[PDB]
Amino acid sequence: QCVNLRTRTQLPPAYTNSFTRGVYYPDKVFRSSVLHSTQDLFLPFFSNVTWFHAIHKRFDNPVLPFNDGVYFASTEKSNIIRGWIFGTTLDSKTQSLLIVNNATNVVIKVCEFQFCNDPFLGVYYHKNNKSWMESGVYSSANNCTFEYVSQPFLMDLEGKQGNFKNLREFVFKNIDGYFKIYSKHTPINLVRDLPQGFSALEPLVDLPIGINITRFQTLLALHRSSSGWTAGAAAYYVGYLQPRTFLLKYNENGTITDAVDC
Amino acid sequence: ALDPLSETKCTLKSFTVEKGIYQTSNFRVQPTESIVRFPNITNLCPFGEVFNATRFASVYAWNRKRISNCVADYSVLYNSASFSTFKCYGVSPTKLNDLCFTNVYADSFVIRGDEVRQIAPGQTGKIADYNYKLPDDFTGCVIAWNSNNLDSKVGGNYNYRYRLFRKSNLKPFERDISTEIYQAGSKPCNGVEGFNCYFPLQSYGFQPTNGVGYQPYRVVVLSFELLHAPATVCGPKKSTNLVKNKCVNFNFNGLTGTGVLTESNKKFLPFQQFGRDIADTTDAVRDPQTL
């Protein structure tokens, strides 16, 4: 509730260059063998992105701003990142948008979550009869409107460490009250936790939330065999959206293959 | 308009015509039919729950169920004929399907027959003032269903109660379940009723031998809200068959137009609903029902 991970030490805000990452479909329109411009919120190419690390005391979990919109490049082996928080005050004062993944399905909720000081979706005794399932991120919640569940999935909750072979990039944008989400999954070869190259992000879900968001936070899982729990290897990044102008090169099959920052 | 030769003379403004070729009109195929498509209406709210709930809350403790993020067919209740009284304020019941709302609440409770007259804007009484009040600008709906064969009990259903006296009048959609003794005189009641003191709540006499005015009526109040936030609930939209190879007027889920629809071999993405040409002109669409 009030106790946090006392083995937590914050790293300085390192930065790396995002070459050509963070391009999404601004609409659900089909286009074949054309080159269209569009003025919307995009990530400028070759911009700086804040590096973050989540491992047992290099464990980073601060509260970031969410003015225009941000990015995530979630690559990890232990699947430490289980969800996110979005809201203004992140307590029972104002409404807060909650997204979680309990290793069986994704669940989205909007309730007056009086969040803890160090929320997390952890698991204990992950030695025998794990069953890949959750085993208290907020203290209370009431008077709430939204709930949603998508298709299920299986997540690995075992504590592992090593190189990463998967990149799950996400975008989060507030469109006149609609909390639009984009995503993509692709294999990678780990270099500095920021693989390079071009890849388009598809829409995942649209959510009529209507919350005025200004901050956010990650739900980094912890595990042991809240004050003395461990955590496997994991890292991620955070971008920042800006009102840029972009070109979009669609191929014959409607897929975006290249882009240009004007 | 007699023959094309005469239409020529009117264009040239000459009763005589020389050899040549002359344009006179513009042929156009008028639309024959009209297509209307809209995806399925799955994930309906359980509106039948509050109308046919196994148990209802008391009047002074009136419950409330929220309705949002679903399609709500209000014409089902209007044509169901499973009710004793039905009246909507501001909007007819058959017309609510054409409207969209931000939030809708269902205040369910049971009352006597004669007490149903108090549930309306601008009314007063034991129920309107001390138990459940509505605003003067109420533009919702009220449904009543006689439950004498369902909720009445030999000796009166004591689980349904209501307030008879209160120190002050309630507000619109206000609720109060306090057991404070209604004080009239200056002396303290000491938690017991009597001289200038009265326990405000009392049970209902819902017996099987009650009359039209005293029998129990399962009442539900449907209030509609139009706020700055986007609409979360709407009515169902109509649809029809899919015509092809014929000039018609298009009205899709979110698109309009006019043209000849025909099968194609394009390959849309799973989350791609319609297409555009090089000039941002529509040239292809995905049917909302069939992929």
Coordinates of C-alpha atoms in Angstrom, one line a residue:
Chain A
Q1 CA 0.0 0.0 0.0
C2 CA 2.6 2.5 1.2
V3 CA 5.7 0.4 1.3
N4 CA 7.8 0.4 -1.9
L5 CA 10.8 -1.5 -3.2
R6 CA 13.7 -0.4 -0.9
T7 CA 16.2 -2.1 -3.3
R8 CA 15.2 0.5 -6.0
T9 CA 17.8 2.9 -7.4
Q10 CA 17.1 5.3 -10.3
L11 CA 19.4 5.6 -13.2
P12 CA 20.2 8.9 -15.0
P13 CA 18.2 9.8 -18.1
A14 CA 20.2 8.2 -20.9
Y15 CA 19.3 8.9 -24.5
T16 CA 19.6 7.1 -27.8
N17 CA 18.6 8.0 -31.4
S18 CA 15.4 6.5 -32.9
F19 CA 16.4 6.2 -36.6
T20 CA 13.1 5.4 -38.4
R21 CA 10.9 3.9 -35.7
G22 CA 7.4 5.1 -34.6
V23 CA 5.3 5.3 -37.8
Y24 CA 1.7 4.2 -37.6
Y25 CA -1.3 4.2 -39.9
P26 CA -3.1 7.6 -39.2
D27 CA -6.4 6.2 -40.5
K28 CA -8.1 2.9 -41.6
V29 CA -8.0 3.8 -45.3
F30 CA -6.7 1.6 -48.0
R31 CA -4.2 2.9 -50.6
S32 CA -2.2 1.1 -53.2
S33 CA 0.9 2.3 -55.0
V34 CA 0.7 5.9 -54.0
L35 CA 2.6 8.4 -51.8
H36 CA 0.4 10.5 -49.5
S37 CA 1.2 13.3 -47.1
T38 CA -0.5 13.7 -43.7
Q39 CA -0.2 16.2 -40.9
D40 CA -0.7 14.5 -37.5
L41 CA 1.3 13.5 -34.4
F42 CA 4.3 11.4 -35.3
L43 CA 7.7 10.7 -33.8
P44 CA 10.4 12.8 -35.6
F45 CA 13.1 10.6 -37.1
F46 CA 16.5 10.5 -35.4
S47 CA 15.1 12.0 -32.1
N48 CA 16.3 11.2 -28.6
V49 CA 14.4 8.6 -26.6
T50 CA 14.7 8.1 -22.8
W51 CA 16.3 4.8 -21.9
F52 CA 14.9 2.8 -19.0
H53 CA 16.0 -0.4 -17.2
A54 CA 14.0 -2.8 -15.0
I55 CA 16.2 -5.4 -13.2
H56 CA 17.2 -6.2 -9.6
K57 CA 19.3 -1.9 -8.0
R58 CA 18.9 -0.7 -11.6
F59 CA 15.1 -0.6 -11.5
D60 CA 13.5 2.5 -13.1
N61 CA 9.8 3.2 -12.6
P62 CA 9.1 6.9 -12.5
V63 CA 6.1 8.9 -13.5
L64 CA 6.4 10.6 -17.0
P65 CA 4.3 13.3 -18.7
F66 CA 1.7 12.5 -21.3
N67 CA 0.9 15.9 -22.8
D68 CA 0.9 15.1 -26.5
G69 CA 1.5 11.3 -26.4
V70 CA 4.4 8.9 -26.0
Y71 CA 5.9 5.6 -27.3
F72 CA 7.1 2.4 -25.9
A73 CA 9.7 -0.1 -27.2
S74 CA 9.1 -3.0 -24.8
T75 CA 11.7 -5.7 -25.3
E76 CA 12.3 -8.2 -22.5
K77 CA 12.8 -11.9 -21.7
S78 CA 11.0 -12.2 -18.3
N79 CA 7.9 -10.2 -19.4
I80 CA 8.3 -7.7 -16.6
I81 CA 6.1 -5.2 -18.3
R82 CA 2.4 -6.2 -17.6
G83 CA 0.6 -3.0 -18.2
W84 CA 0.4 0.8 -17.8
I85 CA -1.4 3.5 -15.9
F86 CA -2.8 6.7 -17.4
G87 CA -4.4 9.6 -15.5
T88 CA -4.0 13.1 -14.2
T89 CA -3.5 12.6 -10.4
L90 CA -3.3 8.7 -10.4
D91 CA -5.5 8.4 -7.3
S92 CA -9.1 8.5 -6.3
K93 CA -9.3 12.2 -6.9
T94 CA -9.7 12.0 -10.7
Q95 CA -10.5 9.2 -13.0
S96 CA -7.6 6.9 -14.1
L97 CA -7.3 4.6 -17.1
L98 CA -5.8 1.2 -16.2
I99 CA -4.4 -1.4 -18.6
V100 CA -3.1 -4.8 -17.3
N101 CA -2.2 -8.2 -18.6
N102 CA -2.7 -11.0 -16.1
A103 CA -0.8 -13.6 -18.2
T104 CA -4.1 -15.0 -19.5
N105 CA -5.9 -12.0 -21.1
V106 CA -5.6 -8.2 -21.3
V107 CA -8.1 -6.1 -19.2
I108 CA -8.8 -2.4 -19.5
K109 CA -10.6 -0.4 -16.8
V110 CA -11.4 3.2 -15.9
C111 CA -12.0 3.5 -12.1
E112 CA -11.0 5.9 -9.4
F113 CA -8.0 3.8 -8.6
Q114 CA -6.3 5.0 -5.4
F115 CA -2.9 3.6 -6.6
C116 CA -0.2 2.4 -4.3
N117 CA 3.2 4.1 -4.1
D118 CA 4.9 1.3 -6.0
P119 CA 2.2 -0.7 -7.9
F120 CA 3.1 -3.9 -9.7
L121 CA 1.7 -7.2 -10.8
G122 CA 3.9 -9.8 -9.2
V123 CA 4.1 -13.5 -8.7
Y124 CA 5.6 -15.6 -5.8
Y125 CA 6.7 -19.2 -5.4
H126 CA 7.4 -19.5 -9.2
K127 CA 9.3 -22.8 -8.7
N128 CA 6.6 -25.5 -8.8
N129 CA 3.0 -25.5 -10.1
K130 CA 3.4 -22.0 -11.6
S131 CA 0.5 -22.5 -14.1
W132 CA 1.3 -19.1 -15.7
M133 CA -1.2 -17.0 -13.8
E134 CA -1.2 -14.0 -11.5
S135 CA -0.6 -14.5 -7.8
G136 CA -3.3 -5.3 -5.4
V137 CA -2.0 -2.5 -7.6
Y138 CA -4.5 -0.1 -6.0
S139 CA -6.1 0.2 -2.6
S140 CA -9.7 1.1 -3.6
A141 CA -11.9 2.1 -6.5
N142 CA -15.6 2.8 -7.0
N143 CA -18.0 4.7 -9.2
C144 CA -16.5 3.6 -12.5
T145 CA -17.8 3.2 -16.1
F146 CA -15.5 1.3 -18.5
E147 CA -14.4 -2.3 -18.8
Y148 CA -13.1 -4.3 -21.7
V149 CA -11.4 -7.7 -22.4
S150 CA -9.7 -8.8 -25.7
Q151 CA -8.6 -12.2 -26.9
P152 CA -6.4 -14.2 -24.4
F153 CA -2.7 -15.0 -24.6
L154 CA 0.0 -16.8 -22.7
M155 CA 2.9 -14.9 -21.0
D156 CA 6.0 -16.4 -19.4
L157 CA 6.2 -15.3 -15.8
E158 CA 9.5 -17.2 -14.9
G159 CA 12.5 -15.2 -13.9
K160 CA 15.0 -15.2 -16.8
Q161 CA 18.0 -13.2 -17.9
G162 CA 19.8 -12.9 -21.2
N163 CA 19.3 -11.4 -24.6
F164 CA 16.0 -10.4 -26.1
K165 CA 14.6 -11.6 -29.4
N166 CA 11.2 -9.7 -29.5
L167 CA 10.2 -6.1 -29.9
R168 CA 6.7 -4.9 -29.0
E169 CA 6.3 -1.2 -29.9
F170 CA 3.2 0.7 -28.8
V171 CA 1.7 4.2 -29.3
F172 CA -0.8 6.0 -27.1
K173 CA -2.8 9.0 -28.3
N174 CA -5.9 10.8 -27.1
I175 CA -8.2 11.7 -30.0
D176 CA -11.0 14.0 -28.9
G177 CA -11.7 11.6 -26.0
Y178 CA -11.0 8.4 -27.9
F179 CA -7.9 6.7 -26.4
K180 CA -6.5 5.2 -29.6
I181 CA -3.8 2.5 -29.4
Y182 CA -1.4 1.2 -32.1
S183 CA 1.0 -1.8 -31.8
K184 CA 3.3 -4.1 -33.7
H185 CA 5.4 -7.2 -32.9
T186 CA 8.5 -8.3 -34.7
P187 CA 11.6 -10.4 -34.0
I188 CA 14.9 -8.6 -33.4
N189 CA 18.6 -9.0 -32.5
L190 CA 19.4 -7.1 -29.4
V191 CA 22.1 -4.4 -29.6
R192 CA 21.3 -1.6 -27.2
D193 CA 17.7 -2.3 -26.4
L194 CA 16.7 -0.1 -29.4
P195 CA 16.7 -2.1 -32.7
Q196 CA 16.6 -0.1 -35.9
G197 CA 14.9 -0.2 -39.2
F198 CA 11.4 0.8 -40.5
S199 CA 8.2 -0.9 -39.5
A200 CA 4.6 0.3 -39.6
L201 CA 2.3 0.1 -36.5
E202 CA -1.3 -1.1 -36.9
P203 CA -4.3 -0.1 -34.9
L204 CA -5.1 -2.4 -32.0
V205 CA -8.2 -1.0 -30.1
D206 CA -10.2 2.2 -30.0
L207 CA -11.5 3.2 -26.5
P208 CA -14.1 6.0 -25.9
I209 CA -12.6 7.0 -22.5
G210 CA -12.8 10.8 -22.4
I211 CA -10.2 11.4 -19.6
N212 CA -7.9 14.4 -19.7
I213 CA -4.5 12.6 -19.3
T214 CA -1.3 14.3 -18.4
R215 CA 0.9 11.5 -16.9
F216 CA 1.5 7.8 -17.0
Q217 CA 3.4 5.0 -15.4
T218 CA 4.5 1.4 -16.1
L219 CA 3.5 -1.7 -14.1
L220 CA 6.8 -3.5 -13.9
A221 CA 6.3 -6.9 -12.4
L222 CA 8.4 -8.2 -9.4
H223 CA 8.9 -11.8 -8.4
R224 CA 10.6 -13.9 -5.7
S225 CA 11.2 -17.5 -4.9
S226 CA 6.9 -5.5 -2.3
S227 CA 9.9 -4.2 -0.3
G228 CA 12.3 -7.1 -1.1
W229 CA 11.1 -8.7 -4.3
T230 CA 13.4 -9.4 -7.3
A231 CA 12.9 -9.0 -11.0
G232 CA 14.4 -10.5 -14.2
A233 CA 16.0 -8.7 -17.1
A234 CA 13.9 -6.1 -18.9
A235 CA 14.3 -2.7 -20.6
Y236 CA 12.2 -0.2 -22.5
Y237 CA 12.1 3.3 -24.0
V238 CA 9.8 6.3 -23.9
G239 CA 9.3 8.7 -26.8
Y240 CA 7.3 11.9 -27.2
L241 CA 4.9 12.8 -30.0
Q242 CA 5.1 16.0 -32.0
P243 CA 3.0 17.6 -34.7
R244 CA 5.1 16.7 -37.8
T245 CA 4.4 16.3 -41.4
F246 CA 5.1 12.9 -43.0
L247 CA 4.9 11.1 -46.3
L248 CA 3.7 7.5 -46.5
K249 CA 4.7 5.1 -49.2
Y250 CA 2.0 2.4 -49.6
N251 CA 2.8 -0.7 -51.6
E252 CA 0.3 -2.8 -53.7
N253 CA -1.0 -4.7 -50.7
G254 CA -1.8 -1.5 -48.7
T255 CA 1.3 -1.9 -46.5
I256 CA 3.5 1.1 -45.7
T257 CA 7.1 0.5 -46.7
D258 CA 8.9 3.8 -46.3
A259 CA 8.4 7.3 -44.9
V260 CA 9.9 10.8 -45.1
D261 CA 10.0 13.5 -42.4
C262 CA 9.3 16.9 -44.0
Chain B
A1 CA -38.7 17.7 -75.6
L2 CA -40.6 16.2 -78.6
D3 CA -37.6 14.7 -80.6
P4 CA -33.8 15.2 -80.6
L5 CA -34.0 17.4 -83.7
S6 CA -36.3 19.8 -81.8
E7 CA -33.9 19.8 -78.8
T8 CA -31.2 20.8 -81.2
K9 CA -33.1 23.9 -82.4
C10 CA -33.7 25.1 -78.9
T11 CA -30.0 24.8 -78.1
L12 CA -28.9 26.6 -81.2
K13 CA -31.9 29.0 -80.9
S14 CA -32.6 28.6 -84.6
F15 CA -35.6 27.1 -86.4
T16 CA -33.1 26.0 -89.1
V17 CA -30.2 23.6 -88.6
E18 CA -27.0 23.0 -90.7
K19 CA -25.1 19.8 -91.2
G20 CA -22.9 18.7 -88.3
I21 CA -22.9 17.3 -84.8
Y22 CA -24.3 19.2 -81.8
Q23 CA -24.3 18.5 -78.1
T24 CA -27.7 19.2 -76.5
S25 CA -28.0 17.3 -73.2
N26 CA -26.2 15.2 -70.6
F27 CA -27.3 11.6 -70.2
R28 CA -27.2 10.3 -66.6
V29 CA -28.3 7.0 -65.0
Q30 CA -30.7 7.9 -62.1
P31 CA -30.4 5.6 -59.0
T32 CA -32.8 2.7 -58.9
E33 CA -32.5 1.4 -55.4
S34 CA -30.8 2.3 -52.1
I35 CA -28.5 0.1 -50.1
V36 CA -28.2 0.5 -46.3
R37 CA -25.6 -1.7 -44.5
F38 CA -24.6 -1.6 -40.8
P39 CA -22.7 -4.3 -38.8
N40 CA -24.4 -6.6 -36.3
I41 CA -25.8 -5.2 -33.0
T42 CA -24.2 -7.8 -30.7
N43 CA -23.4 -7.0 -27.0
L44 CA -26.7 -5.6 -26.1
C45 CA -27.2 -4.3 -22.6
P46 CA -29.4 -6.5 -20.4
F47 CA -32.3 -4.0 -20.3
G48 CA -34.7 -6.9 -19.6
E49 CA -32.9 -7.4 -16.3
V50 CA -34.3 -4.3 -14.6
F51 CA -37.7 -4.8 -16.2
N52 CA -37.8 -8.4 -15.0
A53 CA -35.5 -8.4 -12.1
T54 CA -35.9 -11.3 -9.6
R55 CA -35.8 -8.8 -6.7
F56 CA -36.3 -5.0 -6.5
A57 CA -34.9 -2.5 -4.1
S58 CA -37.0 -0.4 -1.7
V59 CA -38.3 3.1 -2.6
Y60 CA -36.2 5.0 0.0
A61 CA -33.3 2.7 -1.0
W62 CA -33.9 2.9 -4.7
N63 CA -31.1 1.2 -6.7
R64 CA -29.6 2.4 -9.9
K65 CA -28.1 0.6 -12.9
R66 CA -26.0 2.3 -15.5
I67 CA -26.4 1.7 -19.2
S68 CA -23.5 2.5 -21.6
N69 CA -21.3 1.0 -24.3
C70 CA -24.0 -1.1 -26.0
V71 CA -27.0 -0.8 -28.4
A72 CA -30.4 -0.4 -26.7
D73 CA -33.5 -1.2 -28.6
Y74 CA -36.2 0.8 -26.9
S75 CA -39.0 -0.3 -29.3
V76 CA -38.9 -3.8 -27.8
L77 CA -40.4 -2.6 -24.5
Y78 CA -43.0 -0.3 -26.3
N79 CA -44.3 -3.3 -28.4
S80 CA -43.8 -5.9 -25.7
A81 CA -47.2 -5.3 -24.0
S82 CA -45.7 -6.7 -20.8
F83 CA -46.5 -3.5 -18.8
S84 CA -49.3 -1.6 -17.1
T85 CA -48.3 2.0 -18.0
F86 CA -45.6 3.5 -20.2
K87 CA -44.9 7.2 -20.8
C88 CA -41.9 9.1 -22.1
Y89 CA -41.2 12.8 -21.7
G90 CA -39.8 15.0 -24.5
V91 CA -39.1 12.1 -26.9
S92 CA -41.6 9.5 -28.0
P93 CA -40.7 5.9 -27.1
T94 CA -40.6 4.7 -30.8
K95 CA -38.2 7.5 -31.6
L96 CA -35.5 6.9 -29.0
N97 CA -33.8 4.4 -31.3
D98 CA -32.8 7.3 -33.6
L99 CA -30.9 9.1 -30.8
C100 CA -27.5 8.7 -29.1
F101 CA -26.8 9.4 -25.5
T102 CA -23.8 9.8 -23.2
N103 CA -25.2 8.0 -20.1
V104 CA -28.5 6.3 -19.2
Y105 CA -29.5 5.1 -15.7
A106 CA -32.3 2.8 -14.6
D107 CA -33.8 3.6 -11.2
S108 CA -35.8 0.5 -10.2
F109 CA -38.3 0.2 -7.3
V110 CA -41.8 -1.0 -6.3
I111 CA -44.7 1.2 -5.3
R112 CA -48.4 1.1 -4.9
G113 CA -50.8 1.8 -7.8
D114 CA -51.9 5.2 -6.7
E115 CA -48.3 6.3 -5.9
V116 CA -47.3 6.1 -9.6
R117 CA -48.9 9.5 -10.3
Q118 CA -46.2 11.1 -8.2
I119 CA -43.3 9.9 -10.4
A120 CA -43.2 12.8 -12.9
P121 CA -41.7 16.3 -13.2
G122 CA -43.4 18.9 -11.1
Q123 CA -45.2 16.5 -8.8
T124 CA -45.3 16.4 -5.0
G125 CA -46.3 13.9 -2.3
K126 CA -44.9 11.3 0.1
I127 CA -42.9 9.6 -2.7
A128 CA -42.0 12.7 -4.7
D129 CA -40.6 14.7 -1.7
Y130 CA -39.2 12.3 0.9
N131 CA -38.4 9.1 -1.1
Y132 CA -37.5 9.7 -4.7
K133 CA -37.7 13.1 -6.5
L134 CA -37.2 14.0 -10.2
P135 CA -36.3 17.4 -11.8
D136 CA -38.7 19.6 -13.6
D137 CA -36.7 19.2 -16.8
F138 CA -37.1 15.4 -16.8
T139 CA -37.2 14.1 -20.4
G140 CA -36.7 10.4 -19.6
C141 CA -39.1 7.5 -19.5
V142 CA -41.3 5.7 -17.0
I143 CA -42.4 2.1 -17.2
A144 CA -44.7 0.3 -14.8
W145 CA -45.6 -3.4 -14.6
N146 CA -48.1 -4.8 -12.1
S147 CA -46.4 -7.4 -9.9
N148 CA -49.4 -8.5 -7.8
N149 CA -49.0 -12.1 -8.9
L150 CA -45.3 -12.0 -8.3
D151 CA -44.3 -9.8 -5.3
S152 CA -47.3 -9.8 -3.0
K153 CA -47.2 -12.0 0.1
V154 CA -49.7 -13.2 2.7
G155 CA -49.5 -10.6 5.4
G156 CA -47.7 -7.9 3.3
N157 CA -44.3 -7.9 1.7
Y158 CA -42.2 -6.3 4.5
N159 CA -39.0 -6.3 2.4
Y160 CA -40.3 -3.3 0.4
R161 CA -40.5 -0.2 2.6
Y162 CA -40.7 3.6 2.1
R163 CA -40.3 6.8 4.0
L164 CA -43.3 8.7 5.3
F165 CA -41.7 11.7 7.0
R166 CA -38.5 13.6 6.5
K167 CA -37.0 16.8 8.0
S168 CA -36.4 18.2 4.5
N169 CA -37.3 17.5 0.9
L170 CA -35.0 15.5 -1.3
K171 CA -33.2 16.7 -4.4
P172 CA -33.4 15.3 -8.0
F173 CA -32.1 11.7 -8.0
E174 CA -31.2 12.0 -4.3
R175 CA -31.2 8.9 -2.0
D176 CA -31.3 8.6 1.8
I177 CA -31.6 5.5 3.9
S178 CA -31.2 7.0 7.3
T179 CA -33.3 5.9 10.3
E180 CA -33.3 9.3 12.1
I181 CA -36.5 9.9 14.1
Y182 CA -38.5 12.7 12.6
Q183 CA -38.5 15.5 15.2
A184 CA -41.4 18.0 15.5
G185 CA -41.0 19.4 19.0
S186 CA -38.1 20.9 20.9
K187 CA -37.5 17.8 23.2
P188 CA -35.1 15.1 22.1
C189 CA -36.6 11.9 20.8
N190 CA -34.0 9.7 22.5
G191 CA -34.0 7.4 19.5
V192 CA -37.6 6.3 20.2
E193 CA -40.9 7.6 18.6
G194 CA -43.9 9.0 20.4
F195 CA -45.0 12.5 21.3
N196 CA -43.8 14.7 18.5
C197 CA -41.5 11.9 17.3
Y198 CA -42.0 9.3 14.6
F199 CA -39.9 6.6 13.0
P200 CA -40.0 7.8 9.3
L201 CA -39.8 4.4 7.5
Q202 CA -42.7 2.0 7.2
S203 CA -43.3 -1.3 5.4
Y204 CA -45.7 -1.8 2.5
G205 CA -49.0 -3.7 2.7
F206 CA -48.4 -5.7 -0.6
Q207 CA -51.0 -8.5 0.0
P208 CA -52.6 -10.7 -2.7
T209 CA -56.0 -9.1 -2.0
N210 CA -54.9 -5.5 -2.8
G211 CA -56.7 -3.3 -5.3
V212 CA -55.5 -1.5 -8.4
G213 CA -54.4 1.4 -6.3
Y214 CA -52.7 -0.6 -3.6
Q215 CA -51.2 -3.5 -5.6
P216 CA -47.4 -3.6 -6.2
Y217 CA -46.1 -2.1 -9.4
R218 CA -42.5 -2.8 -10.6
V219 CA -41.5 0.7 -11.7
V220 CA -38.3 1.7 -13.5
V221 CA -37.2 5.2 -14.4
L222 CA -35.0 5.6 -17.5
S223 CA -33.3 9.0 -17.4
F224 CA -31.1 10.1 -20.4
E225 CA -28.0 12.3 -20.3
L226 CA -26.5 14.4 -23.1
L227 CA -23.1 15.6 -22.0
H228 CA -19.9 17.0 -23.5
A229 CA -18.4 13.5 -23.4
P230 CA -19.0 11.4 -26.5
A231 CA -22.0 9.1 -26.9
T232 CA -21.6 5.7 -25.3
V233 CA -25.1 4.3 -26.1
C234 CA -27.3 4.4 -29.2
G235 CA -30.2 2.6 -30.8
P236 CA -30.1 0.0 -33.5
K237 CA -29.8 0.9 -37.2
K238 CA -31.6 -0.8 -40.1
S239 CA -30.1 -2.9 -42.9
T240 CA -31.2 -4.6 -46.0
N241 CA -29.9 -7.0 -48.7
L242 CA -26.7 -6.3 -50.8
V243 CA -27.4 -5.3 -54.4
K244 CA -24.7 -5.5 -57.0
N245 CA -24.2 -4.4 -60.6
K246 CA -26.9 -1.7 -60.3
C247 CA -26.7 2.1 -59.8
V248 CA -27.8 2.8 -56.2
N249 CA -27.3 5.2 -53.4
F250 CA -24.8 4.0 -50.8
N251 CA -25.4 4.5 -47.0
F252 CA -22.8 2.4 -45.2
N253 CA -22.0 2.4 -41.4
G254 CA -20.2 5.7 -41.8
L255 CA -20.1 6.4 -45.6
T256 CA -22.5 7.8 -48.2
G257 CA -22.3 7.9 -52.0
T258 CA -23.8 6.8 -55.3
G259 CA -22.4 4.2 -57.7
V260 CA -22.4 0.7 -59.1
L261 CA -21.2 -1.8 -56.5
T262 CA -19.5 -5.0 -57.7
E263 CA -17.1 -7.7 -56.5
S264 CA -13.4 -7.0 -56.7
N265 CA -10.0 -8.7 -56.0
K266 CA -8.4 -6.0 -53.7
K267 CA -6.8 -7.1 -50.5
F268 CA -7.6 -4.9 -47.5
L269 CA -5.9 -5.3 -44.1
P270 CA -8.0 -6.8 -41.2
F271 CA -8.4 -3.3 -39.6
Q272 CA -9.0 -1.5 -43.0
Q273 CA -12.6 -0.7 -43.7
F274 CA -12.7 1.4 -46.9
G275 CA -10.4 2.7 -49.6
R276 CA -9.5 5.8 -51.5
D277 CA -8.2 6.7 -54.9
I278 CA -5.1 8.9 -55.8
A279 CA -7.3 12.0 -55.5
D280 CA -8.7 11.0 -52.1
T281 CA -11.9 9.7 -53.8
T282 CA -13.7 6.6 -52.6
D283 CA -13.3 3.7 -54.9
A284 CA -13.8 0.6 -52.7
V285 CA -15.4 -0.4 -49.4
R286 CA -15.7 -3.4 -47.1
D287 CA -19.2 -4.6 -46.2
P288 CA -19.8 -4.1 -42.4
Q289 CA -21.3 -7.6 -42.1
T290 CA -19.4 -9.8 -44.5
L291 CA -15.7 -9.5 -44.9

